[PDB]
Amino acid sequence: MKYQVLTVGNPNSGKTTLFNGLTGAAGVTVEKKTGSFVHAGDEFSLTDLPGIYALDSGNDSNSIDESIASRAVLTHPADVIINVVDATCLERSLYMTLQLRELRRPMIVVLNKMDALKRERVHLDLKQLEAFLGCPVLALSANNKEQVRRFKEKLHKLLVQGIALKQIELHYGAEFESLIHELEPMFAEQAVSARALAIRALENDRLVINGLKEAERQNVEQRQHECQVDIDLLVANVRYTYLHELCTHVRRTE
Ligand SMILES: [Mg+2]
Ligand SMILES: [Mg+2]
């Protein structure tokens, strides 16, 4: 059975290096490479998504690479999404990981360059990271082809066994959570989390909004204005707080 795998991550996070090591052999050719490798009589079509720092659609140009990647994660179905994070800049790369896990999609966090972090006298509790994120957090180094081969086996087992996904608990605020629950039913029948789609709708992500009827569009529009706090400010603040406490727990100074 053929399995669709999406490799997404920050630019220069090792996301590209993993894809080339695994698969061997468009209009966004910056970071749109499709590859294939076979393991245990099953095929693995991989799509290297452009390196991005956050999720955002475009049509405004200068953001085509980002728009392509954001669109794929939100529409293009995939059996698992390999999110590569560079341990050296841990906090920076986790912003997309938070948005990714919010989608409630099969996810595998692959921590890269863990060896370099040891040299900086920084140690990481990968196990504690797995508990907070609720998704498989695997650690390797994409440079090591030996470790890359070991990763193929872990992925195949994980894909067949099923990816256990413990929903991330965020609680932006009852003020925001009330609005989210009111828009959740519109996105029930999707491929991504209905909750996440409403949050993106409340952030005025036109990509999600354009799939809405004009009437439902006006209903969503009104919710943005009938707020005592700016949606963008509130969402960003909650996301930052979670990231900071997460990093301070799993990290260790010497
Ligand atoms: Mg109200
Ligand atoms: Mg209109």
mmCIF file of C-alpha atoms and ligand atoms in Angstrom:
data_model
loop_
_atom_site.group_PDB
_atom_site.id
_atom_site.type_symbol
_atom_site.label_atom_id
_atom_site.label_comp_id
_atom_site.label_asym_id
_atom_site.label_seq_id
_atom_site.Cartn_x
_atom_site.Cartn_y
_atom_site.Cartn_z
ATOM 1 C CA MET A 1 0.000 0.000 0.000
ATOM 2 C CA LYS A 2 1.334 3.406 -1.016
ATOM 3 C CA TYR A 3 1.675 5.944 1.804
ATOM 4 C CA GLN A 4 1.748 9.718 1.336
ATOM 5 C CA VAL A 5 4.326 11.487 3.515
ATOM 6 C CA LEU A 6 4.752 15.258 3.856
ATOM 7 C CA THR A 7 8.116 16.613 5.017
ATOM 8 C CA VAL A 8 7.690 20.163 6.310
ATOM 9 C CA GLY A 9 9.851 22.308 8.547
ATOM 10 C CA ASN A 10 11.693 25.553 9.002
ATOM 11 C CA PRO A 11 14.167 26.588 6.289
ATOM 12 C CA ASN A 12 17.666 25.229 6.965
ATOM 13 C CA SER A 13 16.201 23.038 9.735
ATOM 14 C CA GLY A 14 17.423 19.902 7.963
ATOM 15 C CA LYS A 15 14.001 19.307 6.407
ATOM 16 C CA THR A 16 15.501 19.202 2.903
ATOM 17 C CA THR A 17 18.479 17.061 3.972
ATOM 18 C CA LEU A 18 16.213 14.321 5.333
ATOM 19 C CA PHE A 19 14.229 14.153 2.079
ATOM 20 C CA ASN A 20 17.314 13.767 -0.130
ATOM 21 C CA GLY A 21 18.756 11.087 2.148
ATOM 22 C CA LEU A 22 15.498 9.133 2.159
ATOM 23 C CA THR A 23 14.398 9.264 -1.486
ATOM 24 C CA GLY A 24 17.785 9.139 -3.213
ATOM 25 C CA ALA A 25 16.626 10.386 -6.616
ATOM 26 C CA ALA A 26 6.996 22.704 -10.514
ATOM 27 C CA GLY A 27 6.474 26.475 -10.341
ATOM 28 C CA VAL A 28 7.852 26.811 -6.808
ATOM 29 C CA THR A 29 10.992 24.749 -7.498
ATOM 30 C CA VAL A 30 12.601 26.607 -4.591
ATOM 31 C CA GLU A 31 11.510 23.858 -2.177
ATOM 32 C CA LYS A 32 8.977 21.648 -4.026
ATOM 33 C CA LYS A 33 10.655 18.261 -4.544
ATOM 34 C CA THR A 34 8.787 14.954 -4.864
ATOM 35 C CA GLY A 35 10.580 11.689 -4.098
ATOM 36 C CA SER A 36 10.015 7.996 -3.541
ATOM 37 C CA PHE A 37 11.545 5.098 -1.619
ATOM 38 C CA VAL A 38 10.240 1.575 -0.987
ATOM 39 C CA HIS A 39 10.391 -0.363 2.295
ATOM 40 C CA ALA A 40 8.889 -3.765 3.191
ATOM 41 C CA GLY A 41 6.755 -3.983 0.067
ATOM 42 C CA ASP A 42 5.169 -0.573 0.683
ATOM 43 C CA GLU A 43 5.823 2.611 -1.285
ATOM 44 C CA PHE A 44 6.539 6.062 0.191
ATOM 45 C CA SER A 45 5.765 9.107 -1.955
ATOM 46 C CA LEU A 46 7.319 12.076 -0.155
ATOM 47 C CA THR A 47 6.718 15.757 -0.879
ATOM 48 C CA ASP A 48 9.231 18.253 0.498
ATOM 49 C CA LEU A 49 7.192 21.328 1.368
ATOM 50 C CA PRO A 50 8.821 24.770 1.228
ATOM 51 C CA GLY A 51 10.563 25.876 4.390
ATOM 52 C CA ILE A 52 8.279 28.209 6.346
ATOM 53 C CA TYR A 53 8.271 29.746 9.812
ATOM 54 C CA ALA A 54 4.481 29.990 10.234
ATOM 55 C CA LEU A 55 1.351 29.047 8.310
ATOM 56 C CA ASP A 56 0.123 31.679 5.853
ATOM 57 C CA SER A 57 -1.455 31.760 2.392
ATOM 58 C CA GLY A 58 -0.494 34.276 -0.271
ATOM 59 C CA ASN A 59 -1.838 35.510 -3.637
ATOM 60 C CA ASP A 60 0.006 38.702 -2.673
ATOM 61 C CA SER A 61 3.283 37.476 -4.238
ATOM 62 C CA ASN A 62 6.628 37.384 -2.391
ATOM 63 C CA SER A 63 4.910 34.619 -0.414
ATOM 64 C CA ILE A 64 4.316 31.990 -3.112
ATOM 65 C CA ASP A 65 6.634 29.450 -1.469
ATOM 66 C CA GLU A 66 4.850 29.924 1.867
ATOM 67 C CA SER A 67 1.394 29.891 0.258
ATOM 68 C CA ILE A 68 2.072 26.595 -1.530
ATOM 69 C CA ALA A 69 3.206 24.880 1.677
ATOM 70 C CA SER A 70 0.379 26.288 3.812
ATOM 71 C CA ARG A 71 -2.170 25.258 1.175
ATOM 72 C CA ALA A 72 -0.848 21.681 1.002
ATOM 73 C CA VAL A 73 -0.887 21.103 4.775
ATOM 74 C CA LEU A 74 -4.467 22.377 4.882
ATOM 75 C CA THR A 75 -5.850 20.500 1.844
ATOM 76 C CA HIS A 76 -3.518 17.837 0.387
ATOM 77 C CA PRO A 77 -4.286 14.622 2.309
ATOM 78 C CA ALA A 78 -1.305 12.825 3.819
ATOM 79 C CA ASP A 79 -0.869 9.745 5.993
ATOM 80 C CA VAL A 80 1.819 11.415 8.170
ATOM 81 C CA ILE A 81 3.575 14.820 8.330
ATOM 82 C CA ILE A 82 7.293 14.658 9.190
ATOM 83 C CA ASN A 83 8.089 17.938 10.997
ATOM 84 C CA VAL A 84 11.857 18.450 11.305
ATOM 85 C CA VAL A 85 13.074 20.770 14.078
ATOM 86 C CA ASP A 86 16.664 21.970 14.534
ATOM 87 C CA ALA A 87 17.561 21.540 18.209
ATOM 88 C CA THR A 88 19.960 24.514 18.162
ATOM 89 C CA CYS A 89 17.110 26.966 17.473
ATOM 90 C CA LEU A 90 14.480 24.971 19.340
ATOM 91 C CA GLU A 91 12.019 27.699 20.337
ATOM 92 C CA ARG A 92 12.005 29.261 16.857
ATOM 93 C CA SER A 93 11.138 26.062 14.964
ATOM 94 C CA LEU A 94 8.379 25.037 17.403
ATOM 95 C CA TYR A 95 6.058 27.857 16.281
ATOM 96 C CA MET A 96 5.096 25.955 13.140
ATOM 97 C CA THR A 97 5.027 22.707 15.139
ATOM 98 C CA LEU A 98 2.365 24.235 17.394
ATOM 99 C CA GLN A 99 0.252 25.231 14.378
ATOM 100 C CA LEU A 100 0.862 21.806 12.820
ATOM 101 C CA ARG A 101 -0.200 19.851 15.903
ATOM 102 C CA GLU A 102 -3.242 22.128 16.219
ATOM 103 C CA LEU A 103 -4.494 20.637 12.926
ATOM 104 C CA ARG A 104 -4.958 17.223 14.615
ATOM 105 C CA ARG A 105 -3.215 15.513 11.729
ATOM 106 C CA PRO A 106 -0.872 12.485 11.885
ATOM 107 C CA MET A 107 2.440 14.045 12.888
ATOM 108 C CA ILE A 108 6.013 12.975 13.605
ATOM 109 C CA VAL A 109 8.438 15.510 15.086
ATOM 110 C CA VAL A 110 11.966 14.619 13.953
ATOM 111 C CA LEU A 111 14.554 16.385 16.097
ATOM 112 C CA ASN A 112 17.647 17.047 13.978
ATOM 113 C CA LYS A 113 21.169 18.194 14.874
ATOM 114 C CA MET A 114 20.813 16.786 18.393
ATOM 115 C CA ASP A 115 24.559 16.050 18.329
ATOM 116 C CA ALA A 116 25.424 19.741 17.905
ATOM 117 C CA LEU A 117 23.291 20.653 20.925
ATOM 118 C CA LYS A 118 25.442 18.406 23.134
ATOM 119 C CA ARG A 119 28.538 20.401 22.172
ATOM 120 C CA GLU A 120 26.781 23.572 23.368
ATOM 121 C CA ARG A 121 26.372 21.950 26.824
ATOM 122 C CA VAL A 122 22.585 21.850 26.378
ATOM 123 C CA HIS A 123 20.619 18.684 27.130
ATOM 124 C CA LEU A 124 17.063 17.935 26.055
ATOM 125 C CA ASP A 125 14.385 15.736 27.619
ATOM 126 C CA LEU A 126 12.971 14.418 24.357
ATOM 127 C CA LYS A 127 10.590 12.231 26.367
ATOM 128 C CA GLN A 128 9.074 15.238 28.159
ATOM 129 C CA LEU A 129 8.695 16.988 24.793
ATOM 130 C CA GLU A 130 6.665 14.018 23.524
ATOM 131 C CA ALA A 131 4.298 14.318 26.497
ATOM 132 C CA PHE A 132 3.471 17.999 25.918
ATOM 133 C CA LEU A 133 3.239 17.750 22.108
ATOM 134 C CA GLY A 134 1.305 14.461 22.071
ATOM 135 C CA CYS A 135 3.008 13.219 18.897
ATOM 136 C CA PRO A 136 5.986 10.919 18.229
ATOM 137 C CA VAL A 137 9.166 12.928 18.812
ATOM 138 C CA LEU A 138 11.983 11.010 17.127
ATOM 139 C CA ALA A 139 15.608 12.134 17.303
ATOM 140 C CA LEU A 140 18.302 11.579 14.683
ATOM 141 C CA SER A 141 20.813 13.376 12.460
ATOM 142 C CA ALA A 142 19.895 13.622 8.781
ATOM 143 C CA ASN A 143 23.576 13.644 7.782
ATOM 144 C CA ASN A 144 24.114 10.124 9.144
ATOM 145 C CA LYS A 145 22.808 7.819 6.410
ATOM 146 C CA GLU A 146 22.930 5.009 8.977
ATOM 147 C CA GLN A 147 20.510 6.880 11.245
ATOM 148 C CA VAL A 148 18.447 7.741 8.153
ATOM 149 C CA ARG A 149 18.031 4.042 7.342
ATOM 150 C CA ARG A 150 16.957 3.346 10.932
ATOM 151 C CA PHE A 151 14.343 6.088 10.545
ATOM 152 C CA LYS A 152 12.755 4.319 7.568
ATOM 153 C CA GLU A 153 11.934 1.327 9.779
ATOM 154 C CA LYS A 154 10.495 3.482 12.575
ATOM 155 C CA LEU A 155 8.287 5.366 10.106
ATOM 156 C CA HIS A 156 6.898 2.188 8.527
ATOM 157 C CA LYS A 157 6.043 0.727 11.934
ATOM 158 C CA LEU A 158 4.514 4.036 13.024
ATOM 159 C CA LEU A 159 2.529 4.397 9.795
ATOM 160 C CA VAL A 160 1.061 0.885 9.970
ATOM 161 C CA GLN A 161 0.543 0.883 13.750
ATOM 162 C CA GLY A 162 -1.205 4.248 13.648
ATOM 163 C CA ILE A 163 0.037 7.583 14.982
ATOM 164 C CA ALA A 164 -1.194 8.175 18.530
ATOM 165 C CA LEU A 165 -2.143 11.865 18.737
ATOM 166 C CA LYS A 166 -2.778 13.380 22.167
ATOM 167 C CA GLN A 167 -4.648 16.636 21.499
ATOM 168 C CA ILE A 168 -2.576 19.660 22.501
ATOM 169 C CA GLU A 169 -4.210 21.644 25.306
ATOM 170 C CA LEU A 170 -3.921 25.377 24.648
ATOM 171 C CA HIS A 171 -6.968 27.251 26.042
ATOM 172 C CA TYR A 172 -6.509 30.616 24.350
ATOM 173 C CA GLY A 173 -9.207 32.078 26.610
ATOM 174 C CA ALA A 174 -12.912 31.616 27.314
ATOM 175 C CA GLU A 175 -13.431 34.869 25.393
ATOM 176 C CA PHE A 176 -11.767 33.349 22.321
ATOM 177 C CA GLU A 177 -12.822 29.745 23.051
ATOM 178 C CA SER A 178 -16.469 30.837 23.028
ATOM 179 C CA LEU A 179 -16.035 32.241 19.515
ATOM 180 C CA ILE A 180 -14.133 29.137 18.360
ATOM 181 C CA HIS A 181 -16.852 26.713 19.470
ATOM 182 C CA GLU A 182 -19.478 28.800 17.680
ATOM 183 C CA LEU A 183 -17.684 28.390 14.312
ATOM 184 C CA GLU A 184 -16.561 24.761 14.777
ATOM 185 C CA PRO A 185 -19.613 23.111 13.095
ATOM 186 C CA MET A 186 -18.927 24.783 9.732
ATOM 187 C CA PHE A 187 -15.663 22.832 9.315
ATOM 188 C CA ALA A 188 -16.711 19.417 10.690
ATOM 189 C CA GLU A 189 -16.462 17.623 7.342
ATOM 190 C CA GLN A 190 -12.833 18.393 6.543
ATOM 191 C CA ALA A 191 -9.365 16.814 6.496
ATOM 192 C CA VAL A 192 -7.924 19.054 9.214
ATOM 193 C CA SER A 193 -9.218 19.933 12.675
ATOM 194 C CA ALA A 194 -12.530 21.784 12.670
ATOM 195 C CA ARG A 195 -11.273 23.680 15.727
ATOM 196 C CA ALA A 196 -8.104 24.789 13.928
ATOM 197 C CA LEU A 197 -10.043 25.957 10.863
ATOM 198 C CA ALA A 198 -12.188 28.220 13.054
ATOM 199 C CA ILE A 199 -9.088 29.685 14.717
ATOM 200 C CA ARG A 200 -7.698 30.411 11.254
ATOM 201 C CA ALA A 201 -11.071 31.904 10.328
ATOM 202 C CA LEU A 202 -10.906 34.139 13.408
ATOM 203 C CA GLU A 203 -7.403 35.197 12.304
ATOM 204 C CA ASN A 204 -8.934 36.235 8.950
ATOM 205 C CA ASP A 205 -7.112 33.600 6.917
ATOM 206 C CA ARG A 206 -8.739 34.303 3.542
ATOM 207 C CA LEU A 207 -7.704 30.831 2.372
ATOM 208 C CA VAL A 208 -10.199 29.269 4.789
ATOM 209 C CA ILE A 209 -12.749 32.075 4.393
ATOM 210 C CA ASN A 210 -12.993 31.728 0.601
ATOM 211 C CA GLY A 211 -14.506 28.258 1.116
ATOM 212 C CA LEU A 212 -17.364 29.862 3.067
ATOM 213 C CA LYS A 213 -20.680 31.102 1.727
ATOM 214 C CA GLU A 214 -21.094 34.877 1.596
ATOM 215 C CA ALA A 215 -23.591 34.756 4.470
ATOM 216 C CA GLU A 216 -21.352 32.553 6.615
ATOM 217 C CA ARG A 217 -18.495 34.859 5.608
ATOM 218 C CA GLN A 218 -20.352 37.848 7.060
ATOM 219 C CA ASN A 219 -21.115 35.887 10.232
ATOM 220 C CA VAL A 220 -17.388 35.177 10.661
ATOM 221 C CA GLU A 221 -16.520 38.809 9.853
ATOM 222 C CA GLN A 222 -18.751 40.056 12.667
ATOM 223 C CA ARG A 223 -17.055 37.866 15.296
ATOM 224 C CA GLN A 224 -13.710 39.539 14.586
ATOM 225 C CA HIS A 225 -15.098 43.013 15.314
ATOM 226 C CA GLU A 226 -17.179 42.114 18.398
ATOM 227 C CA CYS A 227 -14.096 41.471 20.517
ATOM 228 C CA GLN A 228 -12.460 43.434 23.303
ATOM 229 C CA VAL A 229 -8.971 42.157 22.375
ATOM 230 C CA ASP A 230 -7.307 41.994 18.973
ATOM 231 C CA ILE A 231 -7.484 38.390 17.768
ATOM 232 C CA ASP A 232 -3.956 38.404 16.319
ATOM 233 C CA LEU A 233 -2.495 39.779 19.563
ATOM 234 C CA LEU A 234 -4.355 37.316 21.797
ATOM 235 C CA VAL A 235 -3.590 34.210 19.720
ATOM 236 C CA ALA A 236 0.095 35.123 19.493
ATOM 237 C CA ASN A 237 0.358 35.783 23.243
ATOM 238 C CA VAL A 238 -1.167 32.419 24.207
ATOM 239 C CA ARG A 239 1.063 30.615 21.706
ATOM 240 C CA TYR A 240 4.212 32.309 23.046
ATOM 241 C CA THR A 241 3.416 31.475 26.680
ATOM 242 C CA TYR A 242 2.983 27.768 25.906
ATOM 243 C CA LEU A 243 6.239 27.667 23.930
ATOM 244 C CA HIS A 244 8.282 29.386 26.652
ATOM 245 C CA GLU A 245 7.208 27.055 29.466
ATOM 246 C CA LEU A 246 7.647 24.058 27.165
ATOM 247 C CA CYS A 247 11.236 25.002 26.332
ATOM 248 C CA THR A 248 12.157 25.862 29.944
ATOM 249 C CA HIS A 249 11.025 22.411 31.122
ATOM 250 C CA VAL A 250 12.709 20.208 28.516
ATOM 251 C CA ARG A 251 15.925 22.266 28.396
ATOM 252 C CA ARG A 252 18.757 22.164 30.927
ATOM 253 C CA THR A 253 21.659 24.577 31.433
ATOM 254 C CA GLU A 254 24.698 22.285 31.796
HETATM 255 MG MG MG B 1 -21.097 36.631 21.498
HETATM 256 MG MG MG B 2 -17.163 39.258 -0.161
#
